[PDB]
């Protein structure tokens, strides 16, 4: 039992980490009520996969974690327990027994630049797939099957990173749409966070 733990840092940070390298902020030892969320912005989605937001104010969580992404446009639908795709095979992944849920809202006003924003990178291709909840910051030139190459670039030898060009005119379907993904566990351990009562 203490003051409100700083959701204002996770949900109101000046900058968000790129999709290929997402940070975690462990939150513990606080009492938080899920009521200030509705006073943020019109949510594009607020779907919850484990509980309902209305009843979420009367539960105790063993531990919580908050992520920070920059998705592109209408491709947000693939952030779900099971759906696959480019960012769901070579980037952040979700388990088949997910708990917690996803809060997404339009961020065109904050994360956009004239002529596009190049600060966000995503990894298109890998040697293989990746299990849920891992990161891969290693950057090396990738060949194509047979011909060996290193450092140099040319036929079938190219950098494994590509930069977004968001622009302010792409409209719906090609917009940042920031998103934060929580994670809960139901009464498995002594509760670090709870709700007012």
């Amino acid at each position: 039992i203490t003051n409100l733990c700083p959701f204002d840092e996770v949900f109101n940070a000046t900058r968000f980490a790129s999709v290929y390298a997402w940070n975690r902020k462990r939150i513990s030892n606080c009492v938080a009520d899920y009521s200030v969320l509705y006073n943020l912005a019109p949510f594009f989605t607020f779907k919850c996969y484990g509980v309902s937001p209305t009843k979420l104010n009367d539960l105790c969580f063993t531990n919580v974690y908050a992520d920070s992404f920059v998705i592109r446009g209408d491709e947000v639908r693939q952030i779900a327990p099971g759906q696959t795709g480019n960012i769901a095979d070579y980037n952040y992944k979700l388990p088949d027994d997910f708990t917690g849920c996803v809060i997404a809202w339009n961020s065109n006003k904050l994360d956009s630049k004239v002529s596009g924003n190049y600060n966000y990178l995503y990894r298109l291709f890998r040697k293989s797939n990746l299990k849920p909840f891992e990161r891969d910051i290693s950057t090396e030139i990738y060949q194509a099957g047979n011909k060996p190459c290193n450092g140099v670039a040319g036929f079938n030898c190219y950098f494994p990173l590509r930069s977004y060009s968001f622009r302010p005119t792409y409209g719906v379907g090609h917009q940042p749409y920031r998103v934060v993904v929580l994670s809960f566990e139901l009464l498995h351990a002594p509760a670090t966070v709870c709700g007012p009562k």
């Epitope: 000046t14 900058r15 904050l110 956009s112 630049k113 004239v114 302010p168 005119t169 409209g171």
Partner: antibody
């Protein structure tokens, strides 16, 4: 919330402009914000020139990027505009603005006008 | 760039409206259009943002709306001080990303 910029009112056409603009108090802890410069010759219409974000990103306009330069003080004291090869067709007044996405140009300044001294 | 009526006039009090328009191919648009007042010797200021919205500390007589490929602003209550230019701006997609258009004349 005050904006002000200073520059030489009389300029020899061969001289390169060096303009400074200072802002007194902004929400520096934000994203997708910055300061830009706009000019207006007598008559015709406005045209956008350039703007710089807080993250140091640099976004000159096409067809004029060769003759523009930007110096960032990085201490929030002011911002510097530099242009080369002054062209008498570009005689106009230059305005500072607090660029944003919601507000294209939120706040402006009184403006200073400069003309060639040939 | 953009096209706007060079000269607009009307009886004082009521019954006046100004609009902007442009090519749909160049301007993706869908958002982010604004109208600015100008005065001789005084700095411009914002009046409307996001097609039809009003910021704080502005008169209630000023508003507007857009339909199809025609953007417009609604003005009522003509006093002896509303004789100001109205510049309409947006984001384009070719060469210069910012177009200010021809403007108005009051």
């Amino acid at each position: 919330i005050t904006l002000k910029e200073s520059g030489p009112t009389l300029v020899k056409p061969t001289q390169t402009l060096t303009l400074t603009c200072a802002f007194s108090g902004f929400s520096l802890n934000t994203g997708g914000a910055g300061v830009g410069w706009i000019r207006q010759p007598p008559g015709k219409a406005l045209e956008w020139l350039a703007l710089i974000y807080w993250d140091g990103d640099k976004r000159y306009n096409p067809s004029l990027k060769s003759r523009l330069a930007i110096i960032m003080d990085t201490s929030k004291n002011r911002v510097v505009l530099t242009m080369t090869n002054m062209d008498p067709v570009d005689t106009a007044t230059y305005y500072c603005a607090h660029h944003k996405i919601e507000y294209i140009f939120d706040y402006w300044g009184q403006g200073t006008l400069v003309a060639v001294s040939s | 760039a953009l096209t706007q009526p060079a000269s607009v006039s009307g009886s004082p009090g009521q019954s006046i409206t100004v609009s902007c328009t442009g090519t749909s191919s160049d301007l993706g648009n869908f958002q982010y259009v604004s109208w600015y007042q100008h005065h001789p010797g005084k700095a411009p200021k914002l009046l409307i943002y996001e097609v039809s919205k009003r910021p704080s500390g502005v008169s209630n007589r000023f508003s507007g709306s857009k339909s199809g490929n025609t953007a417009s602003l609604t003005i009522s209550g003509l006093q002896a001080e509303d004789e100001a230019d109205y510049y309409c701006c947006s984001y384009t997609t070719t060469t210069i990303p910012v177009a200010f258009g021809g403007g108005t004349r009051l």
